[PDB]
Amino acid sequence: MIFTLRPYQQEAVDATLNHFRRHKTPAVIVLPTGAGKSLVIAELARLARGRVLVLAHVKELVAQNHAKYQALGLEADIFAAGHGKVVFGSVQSVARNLDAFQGEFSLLIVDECHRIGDQYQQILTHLTKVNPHLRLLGLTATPFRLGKGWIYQFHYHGMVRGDEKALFRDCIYELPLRYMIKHGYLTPPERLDMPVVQYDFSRLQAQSNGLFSEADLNRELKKQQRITPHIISQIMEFAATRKGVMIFAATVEHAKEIVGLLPAEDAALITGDTPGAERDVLIENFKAQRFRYLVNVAVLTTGFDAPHVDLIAILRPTESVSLYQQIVGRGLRLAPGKTDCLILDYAGNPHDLYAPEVGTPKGKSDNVPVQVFCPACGFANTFWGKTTADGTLIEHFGRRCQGWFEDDDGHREQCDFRFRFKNCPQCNAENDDTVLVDPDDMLKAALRLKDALVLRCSGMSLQHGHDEKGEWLKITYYDEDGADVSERFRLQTPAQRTAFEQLFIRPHTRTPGIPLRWITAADILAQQALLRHPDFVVARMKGQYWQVREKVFDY
Ligand SMILES: Nc1ncnc2c1ncn2[C@@H]1O[C@H](COP(=O)(O)OP(=O)(O)OP(O)(O)=S)[C@@H](O)[C@H]1O
Numbered sequence: 001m002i003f004t005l006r007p008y009q010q011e012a013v014d015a016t017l018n019h020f021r022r023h024k025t026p027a028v029i030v031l032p033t034g035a036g037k038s039l040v041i042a043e044l045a046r047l048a049r050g051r052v053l054v055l056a057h058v059k060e061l062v063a064q065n066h067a068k069y070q071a072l073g074l075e076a077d078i079f080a081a082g083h084g085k086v087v088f089g090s091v092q093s094v095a096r097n098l099d100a101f102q103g104e105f106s107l108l109i110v111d112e113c114h115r116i117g118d119q120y121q122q123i124l125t126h127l128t129k130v131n132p133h134l135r136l137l138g139l140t141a142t143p144f145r146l147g148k149g150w151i152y153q154f155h156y157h158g159m160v161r162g163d164e165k166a167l168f169r170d171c172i173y174e175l176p177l178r179y180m181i182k183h184g185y186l187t188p189p190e191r192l193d194m195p196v197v198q199y200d201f202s203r204l205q206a207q208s209n210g211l212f213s214e215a216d217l218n219r220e221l222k223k224q225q226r227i228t229p230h231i232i233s234q235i236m237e238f239a240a241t242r243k244g245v246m247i248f249a250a251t252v253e254h255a256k257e258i259v260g261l262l263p264a265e266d267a268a269l270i271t272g273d274t275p276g277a278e279r280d281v282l283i284e285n286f287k288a289q290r291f292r293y294l295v296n297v298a299v300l301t302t303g304f305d306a307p308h309v310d311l312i313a314i315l316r317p318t319e320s321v322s323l324y325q326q327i328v329g330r331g332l333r334l335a336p337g338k339t340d341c342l343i344l345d346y347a348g349n350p351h352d353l354y355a356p357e358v359g360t361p362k363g364k365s366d367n368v369p370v371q372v373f374c375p376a377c378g379f380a381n382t383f384w385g386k387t388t389a390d391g392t393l394i395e396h397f398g399r400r401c402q403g404w405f406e407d408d409d410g411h412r413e414q415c416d417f418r419f420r421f422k423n424c425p426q427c428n429a430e431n432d433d434t435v436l437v438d439p440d441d442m443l444k445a446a447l448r449l450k451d452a453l454v455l456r457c458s459g460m461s462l463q464h465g466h467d468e469k470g471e472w473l474k475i476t477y478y479d480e481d482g483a484d485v486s487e488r489f490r491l492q493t494p495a496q497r498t499a500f501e502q503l504f505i506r507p508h509t510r511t512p513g514i515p516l517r518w519i520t521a522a523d524i525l526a527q528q529a530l531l532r533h534p535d536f537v538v539a540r541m542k543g544q545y546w547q548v549r550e551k552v553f554d555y
């Protein structure tokens with residue numbers, strides 16, 4: 001025709017076609033920010049019946065998307081303040097003019113589809129009303145943002161990222177950032193091997209969601225504000241050998257500090273508090289290099305992502321790779337004679353540009369991604385864990401296999417293998433279909449009763465021995481005030497060592513799914529750092545000595 005697709009662009013067309021030939025449900029394609037997303041929109045539209053509508057929420061992403069589409073030598077329309085086979089509209093402008101969209105429409109593409117949470121469902125109702133079989137494809141460079149969840153639920157590689165509540169049931173294609181860089185479709189990123197002054201944010205604890213707080217951050221900074229223009233110095237140095245420098249501070253009160261730097265008119269701080277009549281006095285100044293330094297709160301973008309950008313200075317710690325790969329990618333575009341984008345990583349971010357995304361909040365700040373094979377389906381999950389020097393698993397915090405599979409009878413389901421269990425994952429209802437009781441409610445019931453003991457567990461000690469019937473292992477749970485409660489396990493018969501693995505190791509192990517190797521009770525004491533202790537123990541006076549009836553783990 002008029003254009004030629006790259007081998008990865010046909011896969012995204014071919015994947016979107018094979019999906020809509022099978023399923024009527026929406027889908028999403030994950031794409032980098034230098035991928036050439038207009039070429040997929042154009043081929044999909046070349047093969048379409050009726051019309052194709054390319055929505056977007058922010059206006060400049062519409063106008064820019066259209067500029068990128070027509071720049072292919074093709075004809076299309078626009079809907080904003082400003083009838084064709086393809087239309088480029090914005091949610092707000094399209095939602096008041098539904099009278100122009102009454103013909104056949106076979107595809108609706110939603111650019112930056114992660115932003116469907118911030119109207120739009122009025123278009124989805126109208127279109128779906130004229131076109132009952134309208135197909136929905138969304139596009140995005142970030143399908144996951146910490147504190148918001150995921151956009152899709154099922155990934156075509158075989159795992160599960162969200163749940164029934166996700167907007168898009170499926171992600172049918174993903175273009176890795178590693179790939180794009182490997183084959184030159186993207187500028188290569190160089191990290192300054194080591195910087196002499198960075199910050200240290202280990203003395204910080206994320207909130208419940210997983211994101212650090214506006215308060216907690218400017219308090220770790222002030223304690224080191226004596227290290228800041230020693231940093232901007234390094235940043236200042238080679239920021240003369242680059243046409244564009246983007247900086248991401250920890251916040252606004254971190255920008256004002258790091259805004260200067262250079263008394264430029266300007267270095268011109270973008271933030272989430274200006275139009276769009278201001279986004280505009282510096283869009284077109286930065287995209288034209290007026291104005292070289294650009295600092296951000298930030299999220300942020302989704303403009304000012306200009307090809308000429310060739311230096312990324314990380315002035316905030318990244319909680320998830322998705323945000324690090326999101327930042328670093330803002331400046332990986334292709335530009336005439338731009339051999340690389342250098343990344344100056346202050347502030348304690350690892351060199352993990354291709355690390356997998358566990359997609360859950362870390363927890364312990366020293367956690368890292370570890371991979372555990374599912375004993376049922378063999379799917380290799382990525383959980384939060386802690387490894388030693390040689391890459392050996394010490395602990396992992398996954399609870400259920402995240403893989404899924406489908407039968408030739410259409411039925412699709414997630415692997416029901418539980419790494420942490422009562423009789424299913426922590427929840428309200430399985431038989432143990434009775435309403436499950438709550439750990440707090442069970443503690444309260446046993447506190448309110450004598451012949452019962454409820455001790456906060458501070459640790460446990462193991463002892464072993466034997467007699468004419470083989471060995472045994474005695475475990476003793478103790479208080480921070482010396483309160484004891486014990487239980488004993490015989491390890492002699494196969495029905496006895498089997499129960500021991502069933503009743504004591506699977507709940508107490510730190511790497512469930514990975515079995516403990518042992519021959520005698522001695523091999524179990526050797527590895528007692530592989531075992532954790534309950535958080536609460538509940539015991540009933542059944543014999544005149546205390547007997548254990550409940551252990552509470554991960555409270
Ligand atoms: N299929 C293609 N064939 C030839 N050149 C391409 C193709 N796709 C992209 N390019 C070129 O590579 C550069 C990167 O693509 P862009 O046009 O920036 O993609 P875009 O859709 O504008 O933005 P995204 O986020 O990457 S989809 C562009 O300047 C194009 O000239």
Ligand SMILES: [Zn+2]
Pocket residue numbers: 374375376377378379401402403415416417
């Ligand atoms: Zn599994």
